Amino acid sequence: ARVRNLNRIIMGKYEIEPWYFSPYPIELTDEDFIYIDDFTLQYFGSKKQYERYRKKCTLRHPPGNEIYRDDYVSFFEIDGRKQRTWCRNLCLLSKLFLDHKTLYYDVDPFLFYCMTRRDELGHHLVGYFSKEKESADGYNVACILTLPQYQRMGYGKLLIEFSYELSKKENKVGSPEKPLSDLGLLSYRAYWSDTLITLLVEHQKEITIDEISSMTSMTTTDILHTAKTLNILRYYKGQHIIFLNEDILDRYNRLKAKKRRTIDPNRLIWKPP
Ligand SMILES: CC(C)(COP(=O)(O)OP(=O)(O)OC[C@H]1O[C@@H](n2cnc3c(N)ncnc32)[C@H](O)[C@@H]1OP(=O)(O)O)[C@@H](O)C(=O)NCCC(=O)NCCS
């Protein structure tokens, strides 16, 4: 009698192996897989069951308001309390790739911003970031995730950039919840670096900390840490600034050479509560 662990989830054409254990309320059997509907995120122990529900009539995108939509991606804002089932399913899926995550069942305190890539086939959920409706620490991101099958394609940086656009619209600085996984912290460091580098080349050769936080919603701490790492911190005109140098120009051009997609602030149709 085999009592197997969840060793693989079948999502669309993808067969993904979890990185960590997730509390799916499922029976342990001699099989080690479950089906995850790529639209509803519902889990099924049998292909037949999955098929049975797949036929049902359902929307083909996350259950929320589309507050951003460009030719590349869309962002749906979902209130956990309004979509408990879907969001709980999202959290269970997310935990498979997180060392730790708050109780998956309690989604009410969160707002989920889910990003989809649109193809000739429609919407495809590629990642998301949750956010406390009320954060005592001012965290502008609780958890953030790019589904495994879509990682290392630039989606993570888009998720992060979007979280800062919300903060900017809210007229507040913000920073991701600590502690961050190594993957998460390294992604933020790259984003913060790319952001200061782009500002120095496209906005001004010299910029004060205040100006930076005002334009990016990045906190003083994340700005200083990033500036020190790049060796671009100085004192000019009576205050601390970051400055441009050949290294930064070089980095900027290399960044641009990758012709990466970015978020257009003008397409965010959203008003904070
Ligand atoms: C952290 C996380 C969101 C990052 O998401 P991601 O989609 O992989 O992020 P990005 O793709 O924007 O990261 C940039 C990387 O992708 C690579 N990349 C992006 N587009 C690419 C392309 N078209 N071709 C080749 N490489 C590409 C970049 O070269 C870069 O590699 P590097 O970090 O070694 O320099 C993701 O690793 C994840 O969900 N991890 C598990 C959950 C987790 O730990 N979340 C954070 C909790 S604190």
Could you identify the atom of ligand 1 that is nearest to the CA of residue 191? 12
Reading the block at residue 26, the tokens are: 């499922």
Could you please report the per-residue DSSP string of 164-216? HHHHHHTT--BEE-SSPPHHHHHHHHHHHHHHHHHHHHHT-SEEEHHHHHHHH
175 lines ligand 1 (CB under 6 A): no
Report the distance separating Cα 202 and Cα 220, nearest Å: 21
What domains sit in the chain, N to C, each tagged with a CATH number? 6-58 (3.30.60.60), 59-179+261-273 (3.40.630.30), 180-260 (1.10.10.10)
Resolution in A: 2.3
Reading the block at residue 81, the tokens are: 């309390």
Binding-site residue positions: 142-146, 151-157, 181
145 lines ligand 1 (CB under 6 A): yes
Reading the block at residue 21, the tokens are: 């254990």
Could you identify the atom of ligand 1 that is nearest to the CA of residue 158? 12
Q: Are 5 and 31 in contact (CB under 8 A)?
A: no
Could you identify the atom of ligand 1 that is nearest to the CA of residue 179? 48
Write the CA distances from 26 to 35, 44, 48, 100, integer angstroms.
12, 9, 16, 20
Choice from 187, 194, 197 to test ligand 1 binding pocket (greatest atom count within 8 A of CB): 187
Residue type, 106: D
Report the distance separating Cα 95 and Cα 19, nearest Å: 9
Note if the bond before 273 is cis, omega within 30 degrees: no
255 lines ligand 1 (CB under 6 A): no
- The distance in angstroms from the start CA to the end CA of the chain is 54
Reading the block at residue 30, the tokens are: 């001699």
Centroid of ligand 1 to alpha carbon of 175 (angstroms): 18
